[PDB]
Amino acid sequence: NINLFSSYQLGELELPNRIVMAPLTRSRAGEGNVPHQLNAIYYGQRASAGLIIAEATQVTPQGQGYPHTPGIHSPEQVAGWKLVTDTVHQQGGRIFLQLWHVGRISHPDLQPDGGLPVAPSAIAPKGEVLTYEGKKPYVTPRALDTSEIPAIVEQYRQGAANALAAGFDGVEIHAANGYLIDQFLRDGTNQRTDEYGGAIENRARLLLEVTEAITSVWDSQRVGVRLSPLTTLNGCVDSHPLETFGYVAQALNRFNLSYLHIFEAIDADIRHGGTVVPTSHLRDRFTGTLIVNGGYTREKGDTVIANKAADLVAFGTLFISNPDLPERLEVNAPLNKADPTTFYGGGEKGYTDYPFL
Ligand SMILES: Cc1cc2nc3c(=O)[nH]c(=O)nc-3n(C[C@H](O)[C@H](O)[C@H](O)COP(=O)(O)O)c2cc1C
Ligand SMILES: [Cl-]
């Protein structure tokens, strides 16, 4: 008799429901990659979520991969995010910041001094990347030196401390979707021969060291980690995802985190001889709160919470188009249809103008 509307204790935070707004890049940052009042309105409109996870936000300038995503590395960015967290709190909500470093998923045109994007290994992604001059081929990223990995961890640590000064309730470490930490996790993108490559413990080392550093800034119950075991996004694949992600789920127990958040790839069942990483494997392996995500509905989300298969259910696409998604789900209202043409960039249209019930 728990469902999507049941309250939940997440550390010291009292969530009114089990509905989470998934992190959604909207590429609507202002000059200097600073959030602004329109962003504050957008998140304030969605404050009925049990928890909002804000869009991926680069922790350092080299961590940007797409034009006009917000950062959390400068004082102006902290002040713009404070507008957002002030508004969400005024509206009675709770919000965590998703901390990002895109690693190889970038272009020199977006990097300081026009440098190469950094990565575990020098493997160019396939296809094209958007720059300020339009789409261009990806370049081959530079493989970080072993001695540079502490600087990466320290960029995440500072990002987390800036998020604390911005007034967030917590942080989510983006270890999913083929970005930097995921690039280290997966053997398709990591062919290093130091203590950060090879065995799973080595490939997970960057994640674990970033997590340790961030739990020295935040109470650990305010730190979450997102994984996406069966995505193929951004050319980042593991050859043994059950072993890799099962190991990671158990290795994170040390830290007493807020949660583990799993994005279940939408094509996992069909773009496999079935799902090779059942979330139940990770649920067994991680001893804390589990957030699931990917194509959820009222019916699917109620099932997973009733069954104890997950504690929280995050919705991405439906929160783009339904600012009051919890109320709509609760009363079985119609749901507004999301318009992909306004997902990224632009202004209020397709962002703050989806109507309330
Ligand atoms: C426009 C858009 C932007 C996204 N940006 C992010 C992001 O910033 N961080 C992230 O971890 N996932 C991101 N995702 C993935 C979503 O959080 C979510 O996992 C995915 O859309 C599947 O959930 P859904 O079926 O409820 O939409 C994005 C998805 C969309 C559609
Ligand atoms: Cl602390």
Numbering used by the authors: 14 to 370
From the paper:
Mutant Q350K crystallized similarly to the WT regarding crystal size and amount. Mutants Q204K and Q350K crystallized in space group P212121, with the RMSD of the crystalline environment in this crystal packing indicating structural differences. However, as demonstrated by Figure 8, the crystal contacts at the mutation sites were present as derived from the NspER1-L1,5 wild-type structure. The crystal contact at positions Q204K and Q350K both reveal an approximation of the intermolecular partners E89 (5.3 Å) and E27 (7.8 Å), respectively, compared to the WT. For mutants Q204K (4.5 Å) and Q350K (7.8 Å), the formation of a long-range ion pair between Lys–Glu, which could exhibit an interaction within a range of 5–10 Å, could account for the enhanced crystallizability, especially for mutant Q204K. Introducing a lysine at any of the neighboring NspER1-L1,5 positions Q350, (D352), and T354 led to an interaction with the intermolecular amino acid residue of E25/27. The neighboring NspER1-L1,5 mutants Q350K, D352K, and T354K led to an interaction with intermolecular E25/27 and an increase in crystallizability (Section 3.2, Section 3.3 and Section 3.4), with the strongest impact for T354K.
